[PDB]
């Protein structure tokens, strides 16, 4: 006897600006850290970059009408800070704001709720040049200026706002693994940049309470809930260490304004804990969000990792199955394959019960409503003659996840909406274009833009039916 | 690399009044529910009861001397409400108080820190007769007045207090399994009494803040940390339900003053949730403790339990190994033996790492300092020629748990103290005397009451040494 999806439930889809828009140098846009980074040889699969992407900047009207045909209730998109401030903190580029105003008016004329993400990884390069972007306190008031600019221009028409999208990923990939700008591999630097970003998050939520008093705002955390391998007590302890270090490290700051203490102590023992200024704890504790945004693709299984043990591991970016290997922190935990679920070709675990677990943990720990800001399956799609894309595998993966969402609602979790990643196919940051996530196929590949034509996948019509029935038919 | 135990670490040992005191009808002592219950034939192994026990009411001076010789920094005991108010709510019994006053002066004069437990399961039978005891709100101001009397008489000499001891055990065993007074098997009544015990806990903490401003107080919870059997997602989900239902159900009320929602909603849907009055939440939320008390003996591993599957199961109090059977809640979870630890012959888990996990879960979820109020191993001891009890099995169990406490302190958990269970052998509630927990053997069995002479076991000398080396030598 399941609860129904509430009447307001935001059935959505999502994108990110640098992955979709193109027009990387048009209408006064400044360079972002991604415009520069993806151009350095070797950084991205086959040198793929966002100069054009799938040209959503020019094609937004076509894309929006396709959202209207699907009947989408909400659209989640990111604003590119370099179009608004080409030098990050100078004078506003009105042409930049005018694209987003055009896009927002298009959505509202079709009855679609905009969900605006303030930051999806594309800090302007000028700020990196000036003071090292996220590594400097100067970015707090710079992000603030930007965010208020958007709050004052669009706050009357946008109620739902996301602050930092997957801060855990952009910080860790940019400063620990070196895979994303600025390409640094330095844990001390990572944790310092992380602290600054936590302060910037708080500062903008606070500003939001003044400028958009009737809006709702949250960060969007990349959440992979941890499991222990088994009931061996050392494996369970690994699970405690992992959930704390990977998930609580961020979500507790978001919900409570405090870092967990075991993880803090372990960092301190290693000289890695961030520098804290007078007033930091106060700011962080006073920035309560309306919801926890959750981007969910998979759970992670862990086991005991001796101090002489596994550290960085191999990340599958090819799409050859079986190629990833264990990653962890020596002495705390390492990952291991969950033998009780299937994986993708990119070795991502398929675990829709995991999403129920994840949503249950957040309610249980923080008592927060959740907006699911991303969930999706990336796979090769074949375009068959007659402009046909049979993506049964995507429908299956989305069906099972939406089913478990309802179970969670039934359990008592306040879930505000569900945004599938992605609306159209788009550019993956490191893996090019062939790992497709859209409801709408874009005719291009890694070698050619072809005509970038939009072709509705079978999953398009499945989700249209889900939305028309408010989830009752899956 | 281990931190040492702090310099003021309360190395302790513990008892419960009914289990140790006797003098069941002396100096004005009223009847307790256990005096009555235990006399009913069937209830207790071979009719054993607390009329005499180990006669600590008469031999306390010999008992505090053996403490001083061991060098305990603290002793945890419970006050019998029926020595103080024979009627529960009538006139004060100055002689009942005088006994506790003599115990505390004895302890102080050997520089031992008294830890006073207000309630260990022995409400005056007169309150059960007048109004159902814990099933009535009337027990709130009666328990309060009792507590306030103790705080007024002893607060200047006792800094550490426990409020309700193992509340989950006296409620469950007393109102669901029917093994303790009042002998009931009714979940609705269980949860009502549970809720009233919660308000009583809170009310006495709020009194304590006024009467003992420089003191420290908290409840003590009987904690078996739940583990998932494996990384099967349905088993992890089972663990989420089990830890919330079995553990958070109590600890979140103690720390935060709120029940968890998924558990509450499950009860609400069975008709089982308690009755709430105006002011309940405000009082519960305003009763922050200084610490969380923890009674730990073992972890519990769980797995998926179908809606039709296992319910209440078979306990093994007989001591023959292998006879316990799975206990659970259909739909949520059921227990299963953990194949990665050994058990006792009572099918209890031997899992010292389990304690560190537990301590880590409390600091992580609540940020509270922990007082370990009970841990110990029960076994048969043989008295051998020359007054020698070679309790190696017990030393070994206790050593591993103290080793793991050190690791937790090193992880950054604030552990205030550790009270082994128990100082002298004592009366078990239901199983008699033969499963011994003491450092000090007491000469009596289930049949022959002999002379009750105190004989130091091998473990007494072990623990004297632990305390002498502040934990350095284990």
Give the helix/strand layout.
Two copies of one chain form a homodimer.
Chain A: E1 10-14, H1 17-20, H2 33-37, H3 56-70, E2 74-78, H4 81-84, H5 94-109, E3 113-119, H6 125-131, H7 138-154, E4 160-165, H8 167-175, H9 187-211, E5 216-222, E6 226-228, H10 233-256, H11 261-269, H12 280-285, E7 292-295, E8 300-303, E9 328-329, E10 333-335, H13 352-366, E11 370-374, H14 392-411, E12 415-421, E13 440-442, E14 454-456, H15 458-468
Parallel strand pairs in A: 1-2, 1-12, 2-3, 3-4, 4-5, 5-7, 6-8, 7-11, 11-12
Antiparallel strand pairs in A: 8-10, 9-10, 13-14
EC number (chains A, B): 3.2.1.85
GO molecular function (chains A, B): 6-phospho-beta-galactosidase activity; beta-glucosidase activity
Binding site for beta-D-glucose 6-phosphate 2 (chains A, B): 19, 374, 421, 429, 431, 435, 437
CATH superfamily of chain A: Glycosidases
**Share in β-strands of chain A:** 5-15%
Question: How many structural domains in the coordinates of chain A?
Answer: 1
Radius of gyration of chain A: 21 Å
- For this entry, what is the oligomeric state of its chains? homodimer
Task: Assign the CATH architecture of chain A.
Answer: Alpha-Beta Barrel
* Termini gap of chain A: 16 Å
N-to-C SSE series of chain A?
Answer: EHHHEHHEHHEHHEEHHHEEEEHEHEEEH
What is the count of DSSP helices of chain A, taking H or I runs of 4+ residues?
15
PDB class: hydrolase
Keywords: TIM-barrel, dimer, glycoside hydrolase, 6-phospho-beta-galactosidase, hydrolase
Assembly: dimeric
Entry title: Structure of Gan1D, a putative 6-phospho-beta-galactosidase from Geobacillus stearothermophilus
């Amino acid at each position: 006897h399941l609860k129904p999806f509430p009447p307001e439930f935001l059935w959505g889809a999502a994108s990110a600006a640098y992955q979709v828009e193109g027009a990387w140098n048009e209408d006064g846009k400044g360079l972002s850290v991604w415009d520069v980074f993806a151009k350095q040889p070797g950084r991205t699969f086959k040198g793929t970059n966002g100069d054009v992407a799938v040209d959503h900047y020019h094609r937004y009207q076509e894309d929006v009408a396709l959202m209207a045909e699907m009947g989408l209730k909400a659209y989640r998109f990111s604003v590119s800070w370099s179009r608004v401030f080409p030098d990050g903190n100078g004078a506003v580029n009105e042409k930049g704001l005018d694209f987003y105003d055009r896009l927002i008016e298009e959505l509202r004329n079709h009855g679609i709720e905009p969900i605006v993400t303030l930051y999806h990884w594309d800090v302007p390069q000028a700020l990196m040049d000036a003071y090292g972007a996220w590594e400097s306190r100067r970015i707090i008031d710079d992000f603030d200026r930007y965010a208020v600019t958007l709050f004052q221009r669009f706050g009357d028409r946008v109620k739902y706002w996301v602050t930092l999208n997957e801060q855990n990923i952009f910080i860790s990939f940019g400063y620990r693994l070196g895979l994303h700008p600025p390409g640094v591999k330095d844990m001390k630097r990572m944790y310092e940049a992380n602290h600054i970003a936590n302060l910037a998050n708080a500062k903008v939520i606070q500003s939001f309470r003044h400028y958009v008093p009737d809006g709702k705002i949250g960060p969007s955390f990349a959440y992979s809930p941890m499991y222990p391998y088994d009931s061996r007590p050392e494996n369970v302890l690994a699970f405690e260490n992992a959930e704390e270090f990977q998930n609580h490290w961020w979500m507790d700051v978001y919900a409570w304004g405090m870092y967990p203490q075991a993880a803090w102590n372990y960092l301190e023992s290693q000289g890695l804990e961030p520098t804290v200024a007078p007033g930091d704890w106060e700011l962080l504790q006073a920035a309560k969000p309306d919801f926890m945004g959750v981007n969910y693709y998979q759970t992670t299984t862990v086991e005991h990792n001796p101090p002489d043990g596994v550290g960085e591991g191999v990340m599958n970016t090819t799409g050859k199955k079986g190629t990833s290997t264990s990653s962890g922190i020596p002495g705390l935990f390492k990952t291991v394959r969950n033998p009780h679920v299937d994986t993708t070709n990119w070795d991502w675990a398929i675990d829709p019960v995991g999403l129920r677990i994840g949503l249950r943990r957040i309610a249980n720990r923080y008592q927060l409503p959740i907006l699911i800001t991303e969930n999706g399956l990336g796979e090769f799609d074949t375009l068959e003659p007659g402009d046909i894309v049979n993506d049964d595998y995507r429908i299956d993966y989305l069906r099972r996840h939406v089913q478990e969402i309802q179970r969670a609602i039934t359990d008592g979790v306040d879930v505000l909406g569900y945004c599938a990643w992605s609306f159209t196919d788009l550019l993956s940051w490191l893996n090019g274009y062939q790992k497709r996530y859209g409801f709408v196929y874009v005719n291009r590949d890694d070698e050619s833009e072809k005509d970038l034509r939009r072709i509705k996948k079978k999953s398009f019509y499945w989700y249209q039916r889900v939305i028309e029935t408010n989830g009752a038919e899956l």
